[PDB]
Amino acid sequence: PQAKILSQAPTELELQVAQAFVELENSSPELKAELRPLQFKSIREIDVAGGKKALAIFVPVPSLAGFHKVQTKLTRELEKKFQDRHVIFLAERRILPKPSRTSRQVQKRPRSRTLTAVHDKILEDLVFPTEIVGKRVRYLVGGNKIQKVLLDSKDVQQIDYKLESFQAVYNKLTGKQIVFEIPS
Amino acid sequence: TRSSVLADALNAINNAEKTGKRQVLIRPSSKVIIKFLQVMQKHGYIGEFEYIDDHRSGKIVVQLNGRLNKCGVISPRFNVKIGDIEKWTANLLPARQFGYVILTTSAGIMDHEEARRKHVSGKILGFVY
Amino acid sequence: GRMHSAGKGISSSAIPYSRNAPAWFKLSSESVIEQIVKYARKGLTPSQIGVLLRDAHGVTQARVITGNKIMRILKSNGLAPEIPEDLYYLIKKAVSVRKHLERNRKDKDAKFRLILIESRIHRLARYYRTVAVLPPNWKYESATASALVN
Amino acid sequence: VLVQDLLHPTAASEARKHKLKTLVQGPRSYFLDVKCPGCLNITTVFSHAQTAVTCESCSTILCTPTGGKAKLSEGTSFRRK
Amino acid sequence: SINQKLALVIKSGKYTLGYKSTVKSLRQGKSKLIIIAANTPVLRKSELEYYAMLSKTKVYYFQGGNNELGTAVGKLFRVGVVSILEAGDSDILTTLA
Amino acid sequence: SKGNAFKHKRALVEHIIQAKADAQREKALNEEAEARRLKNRAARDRRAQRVAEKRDALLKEDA
Amino acid sequence: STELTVQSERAFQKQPHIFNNPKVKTSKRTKRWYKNAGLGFKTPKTAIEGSYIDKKCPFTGLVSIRGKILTGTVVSTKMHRTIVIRRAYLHYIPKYNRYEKRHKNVPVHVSPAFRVQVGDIVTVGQCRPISKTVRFNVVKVSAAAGKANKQFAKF
Ligand SMILES: [Mg+2]
Ligand SMILES: [Mg+2]
Ligand SMILES: [Mg+2]
Structure with a gap:
C-alpha cells in the first residue's frame, strides 16, 4: 500500500505522507480515476524563515495533469492534518548541462531540459492555482539580481500565507532571490 | 532593419542623458545589453535597471543618475589584440584616468581595465564615460 | 516594412502573455485536434482552420490548447x-x-x-x-x- | 517631464495606448457567450469574429463581420468570457 | 467557388474524365453529376444532356472550355466532360451549383 | 537520341548500362529505407508500445 | 567499386607485385593489397573488399599521404577519378582592419572507394604530384545526412 504510492524506499518522513494519502482516499466519489493511479516520487523538507516548514512533493513529469485537477483539495486537506507546514507540488524535470566546445556530442538538448526553462517551470508549478501575469528582474546597483513575479488577483486567497514559503523553496532549489506582488 | 540591438539601446540612453531624463525604455533587451549595462552599473555610470519580461524579447528600464556623458558602440566588432587595446582607449576615451572600452571576450564581457588584469582580449563592443 | 511597397503599417495581432489559457476553455485538447482534422478534410488551409476555431469555437490558439501548431498537426496526421x-x-x-x-x-x-x-x-x-x-x-x-x- | 515611473503607468494611460505599445502587449479583444433567441445553446464567439458565426439552431447569423468587432444579430443576448 | 469544389472532389473523391467514360458511367447509373465544358460540341452536349435526363442526374455547365476544365481538375490534357462517380469530402453535390 | 550526343550505337549502349546501374542503386536504397522505417518503426510502434511498455513502467512495479 | 568493368582498358589492370598464384587456391580468388594511410584515417571497407585497382588511391595504390591535410567543398566531379574542391577563406587587409572573402579551387584525385557528390565537405591529404595540377587525395568524406529526407514527394 505505502510502497505502491511512494515509488522509493527511503526515508521515514514521507511514509507518513504515504499514510496520509491512503487514509484520505476514503472519498470514493472522487478517488475513482482521479486519485488512485497518482503516485509521487519524493518529499523535500525546507525551513521557512518565518518560523515554519515547507513540504515539497516531487512529481513524475507525465503525472502532473492528474495532480493539478485535485491539487486544491489535496493541498488543503494535507495542510489541515499537518499544521505548521506549507505543502507544494514540484515536477521532477531533468536538467542537462550546456554542451562545451571541446565536449563530445550527446543528442541535442531540448529546450525543456535547459536550466532557464526548468527554473521558470519550477516557478509555475510552485504557484500553481493562480496564473503568472508578468515577471520582472531588478538588477540592483550593488550587483544583486532580484526576480519579481506578478500574480493575477483571482484565487490569490489560496496562496497569501504561502508567499514567504514560496520564496524560501525557490531560493533553496535555485539559489536565486525572488519576490512576489499581486496587482489589483 | 534592426542590425544592432545594442546600438539601439545605447542610442536611447544617450538621448535620455542629453534631455536630462532619469529613465529610459529599451527594446528588445539582448544578453549583450544586459551584460553591457552591468559594467555601467558596476562603475556607477547608471543606477538601477529592470527587465520587463514580455514573452517576445524583453524590455529594459534603466535608472539614470546623470553621471554619464556618452555610451556608444563600435560597430563592426573589430578584433582587438592586447597591444591594440591602448590604441582604442586613446581614440575613444577623453582621459587616461577614467572611461572604459567595453570588450567581449571568451573570459566574458568586461571593460578594458579588467581585460588587462585578466590578460584577455577579443572583440570591441563599445565605450562609456 | 512592406517588402514590395512604401507602406509602414503595423497591423499585427497582439497574442496574450499567457501560454496556458484562458481557464474558461472546457473543450479537450484532443477534441480540438480531430476538429482540426475535420476542417482539414473539408479542404481548409491552416489559416482558415485557425480563424474558424477562433470564431465558432473558443480556440484562441491551437498551440496554447493542443500541444503544437496547426500545420504540425496536419503533417502529423498526414494531411500536409x-x-x-x-x-x-x-x-x-x-x-x-x-x-x-x-x-x-x-x-x-x-x-x-x-x-x-x-x-x-x-x-x-x-x-x-x-x-x-x-x-x-x-x-x-x-x-x-x-x-x-x- | 524627465522623471516618471515607466514600470507603473496609470491604468488610464495604458487603456488609451495602442495594443502593441503597452508595457507588455496584449489583445484588447475578448470572447462572448451568446444566447440565440431560438434555443438555449452556448456558442463561443470572438469579439472580432470577422465571419457569420452560426449555431446549430439559428443557422443564418449569430454575428456579422465588420471592419472591427463583429456585429451580433440584433436579437441575441451575450455575456463576456 | 466551383473550382475549389472541383479541386476537392479530385483529391478526395471518385471521378472519371472523357466522353466515353462519362457515357459509360451514365449508362451504368454510377454518376451523380456531370460537368460539361463551354466549347463542347452541341451535338455531344445535347447527347450527354439526353443520357443524363434518362439517368436523372444533374448537369453543370462549366464556364470555360476543355482547356479550363482540364486545368480545373488538376490535369494538363484537355478534358471535355467530367462525371463525378461519388464525391469525397466535397460539397459539390449538396451545393446548388 | 533525336538530339545529338549519342555518337553511335556503342555510346548509347554504355549510356543505357550506366543508367540502369544508377537507377537500380537509387531503387535499392529507396526500398531499403522504406523497409527500414516499416520494420523498425511502424511494426515497433504497433507492438513495442502496447504489449510490454505498460508492463515494466508503472503497473507491475507498483506492487 | 566492386563492379562496372574493372578491366575496361587495353592494359590488364592490377596491383603491382601482388601475385595471384593459380596453383594454390586460397578461398578468396583475388589477393588484394591495402594499407592504412596514417594520420588517423580509417581505410574504408569499400577499399578492403572492392575490385578496383587505382594505383593513385591512398589505401590501395602506390602513393603516400604526407604534408598538409586540407578541407574543402566539392564543386566538380566531372573528371574521371578527379574532383575540384573549393577552399574558402578570409583575407585580412590591415589598412581597413577588415577581411574579404577569397577562394581557391584545388583539383583532387578521388579514389573509387569514395563516392562524392557536388556539395560534399571533403577532407584531402597531400601526396606526390598526381598529374599536372593534382597534388592531393581524398582521405575522408563528410556526407552524413544531406537534409534531403523532407525534400521528397508526400502521400
Ligand atoms: Mg520596400
Ligand atoms: Mg527591398
Ligand atoms: Mg514598423
Missing part, C-alpha cells in the same frame, strides 16, 4: 499539402494576374505587379528549398505554373 499555403496563394495570385495580362496587354501596372508577385514567389521558394520543405530543383515555371493551383 504538396506546397506550403503562403507559397500556394502567391502562385494563385500570379496565375490570376498573368491570366488578366493575356487579355489586357496594355495593363502595364499589372505587368509591374506581376514582377513583384513573382519576386515574392522566387524568394519564398528559395527559402523553402533551403529549409528543405520543397525538393531541390523545384521551380515556379510561370507557364505550367497554373497546374499546381488550378
